[PDB]
Amino acid sequence: PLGSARMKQFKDMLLERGVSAFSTWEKELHKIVFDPRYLLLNPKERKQVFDQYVKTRAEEERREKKNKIMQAKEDFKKMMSRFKAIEKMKDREALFNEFVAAARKKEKEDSKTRGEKIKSDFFELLSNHHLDSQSRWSKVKDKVESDPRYKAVDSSSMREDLFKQYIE
């Protein structure tokens, strides 16, 4: 949405005549100087529109390139025809090992965060009750067997051990 029809036309001309975004005005001038639309702006205005056309086009290209790369991953990574998208095998394997060697690294996490969680939830379960050294698992079991923080501990014996830990 550039100000005026006059400048729109100049911008258009820049595109149609293939003026580069990585060059000097002095060296691109030859692509436009013979074009009737060149006559529609004074020098200051010519500079305005050129500077804007060059900044805008470089950024669009820089970005088109990146967003294509990131998008190719996010789809290769998602398929786990999106396989062909990546070129070679050398590239599409430092990635097939990005996912797998990060999907196992999410379990030297997930099996520990949930790990300590089953435990702490069993302690928290226990702490809802008034317990001490005199407390006896026989009489306590019955109070908390319905609860989900209890069922979560899958070893009837390990439950007992925990309650022993908690009572020490």
UniProtKB/Swiss-Prot annotation:
Induction: Up-regulated in brain tissue from patients with Huntington disease. Signal peptide: none annotated. Transmembrane segments: none annotated. The modification Phosphoserine is found at residue 157. Detected in brain neurons. It is found in: Nucleus. Disulfide bonds: none annotated. It comes from the Eukaryota. Residues 5-56, 69-102, 114-168 form the FF domain. The FF domains bind the phosphorylated C-terminus of the largest subunit of RNA polymerase II, probably mediate interaction with HTATSF1 and preferentially bind peptides with the consensus sequence [DE](2-5)-[FWY]-[DE](2-5). The WW domains bind Pro-rich domains. Binds formin. Interacts (via the second WW domain) with TREX1 (via proline-rich region). Binds RNA polymerase II, HD and SF1. Transcription factor that binds RNA polymerase II and inhibits the elongation of transcripts from target promoters. Regulates transcription elongation in a TATA box-dependent manner. Necessary for TAT-dependent activation of the human immunodeficiency virus type 1 (HIV-1) promoter. This is Transcription elongation regulator 1. The lineage of its organism: Eukaryota, Metazoa, Chordata, Craniata, Vertebrata. The gene is TCERG1.
